Amino acid sequence: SKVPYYKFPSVTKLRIRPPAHALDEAYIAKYNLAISRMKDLDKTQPDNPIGFKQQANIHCAYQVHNSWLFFPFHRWYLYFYERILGSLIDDPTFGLPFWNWDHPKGMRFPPMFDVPGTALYDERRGDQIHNGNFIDLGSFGDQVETTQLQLMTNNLTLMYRQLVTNSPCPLMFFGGPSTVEAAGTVENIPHSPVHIWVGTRRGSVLPDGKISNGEDMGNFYSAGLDPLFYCHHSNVDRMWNEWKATGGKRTDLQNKDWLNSEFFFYDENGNPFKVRVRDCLDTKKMGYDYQPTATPWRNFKPKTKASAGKVNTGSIPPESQVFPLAKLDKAISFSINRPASSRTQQEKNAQEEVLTFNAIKYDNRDYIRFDVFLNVDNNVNANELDKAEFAGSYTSLTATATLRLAITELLEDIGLEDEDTIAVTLVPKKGDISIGGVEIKLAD
Ligand SMILES: [Cu+2]
Ligand SMILES: [O]
């Protein structure tokens, strides 16, 4: 090969990635100009690596997904993508905006992307994105079944569960290192539902005609053909920064195999380079940062319980009697034993208590979603996620996958810390789902 490693150029001012909503019209104007000139290369220089289609093919070429390589790959991906945009308009400080879908003011479709006849527009998008509707951060392809207020409440609860509760340590945030999918918190939710919510409905008839397969954002191979793809991933990249902001155990993976993993990218001059994961840990050392923006989901630890008291775990079947579960056709409840109870804080400091669902199997072309609750029964209202019992959710953009949930916070809030056995309830929302086994392990 002999391709050199990337040399960081000299860094003048920091590039500032701003929120996509209510951006000034002059910013939108040159963002459209950069994209327009990127798309022109599809015609004038189809094999130029910086052109629109060739950049889209980076996602459609790159096992980088459902692994701990998810965040660093897309950071480097967007790093060169942002540099290409700035260089096409002679703007060396151009910042790639981020779709602020974790903030109530950024949860609508960003207006700048919905202007037909502009370079940022894409007709291959779904219909539920208009009419001033809020995004559904737990979308599985259907229309929202709740009020917009409950939708907002669920969105912010999902953010809290995904950025705080279920990502207390690096491996659960970034993902894991076979066909078993080991996605982290964010790559599952809200990353996957945003793709689903923006894309066309699978089975629908596309522009002209083809049966849509979810193009553009809702299908993995064509997602890069929507300019909004990069704006979404800008906020995904921002989630990495916001996750580390509170310190403690939420730091970068220190494993040498992860740090020294390499990717391949062409820079804005069309020159090939190898890049290391260890060299993208600090965005400011790559020449960019995010505009400081409030994160109100940090305050959405649920304050109420769905059900008072404790479930009688003797009236429900044990995990050993339910799994392997051939089909999660409806809500089911089961008891499960904990490795230890009455844990001290020094034990919690060492090992997280993790509820793990093993061998989630389904057809990778179907929309999949199920929710997990502790200490409820089969009649739990799964539309109300702002409850102390809501643990998390699994979704999918035959596949085999794993879901891991950090439950120490819930055990404290619900009052189950001295219990050796607890109740778990699975609520399916979409798809044909089988589950091989469920366990509570004390992890890293
Ligand atoms: Cu994505
Ligand atoms: O992605």
Numbering used by the authors: 35 to 96, 109 to 223, 228 to 447, 459 to 505
The authors write:
SlPPO1 was crystallized as latent apo- and holo-enzyme (without and with copper). The structure of the holo-form lacks a large part of the N-terminal domain (model starts at Ser35) leading to the absence of two highly conserved disulphide bonds (Cys11-Cys27 and Cys26-Cys94). A characteristic structural feature of some PPOs is the formation of the thioether bridge which is missing in SlPPO1. Despite these gaps, especially that one between the first and second CuA coordinating histidines (His93 and His111), the electron density of the active site region indicates an intact dicopper centre. The two copper ions exhibit low occupancy values (CuA = 0.3 and CuB = 0.1) which might be the result of copper loss during the X-ray diffraction experiment. The presence of an ‘oxygen moiety’ between the copper ions suggests that the enzyme was crystallized in its met-form with a CuA-CuB distance of 4.2 Å, which is in accordance to the met-forms of other structurally known plant PPOs. The position of Phe270 is significantly shifted in comparison to the gatekeeper residue position in other plant PPO structures further confirming its high flexibility, which might have an impact on the catalytic behaviour of SlPPO1. Comparison of the gatekeeper residue positions between the apo- and the holo-structure reveals a significant positional shift, which is only possible owing to the absence of the thioether bridge in the holo-structure. The Phe270 residue of the holo-form would sterically interfere with a present thioether bridge.
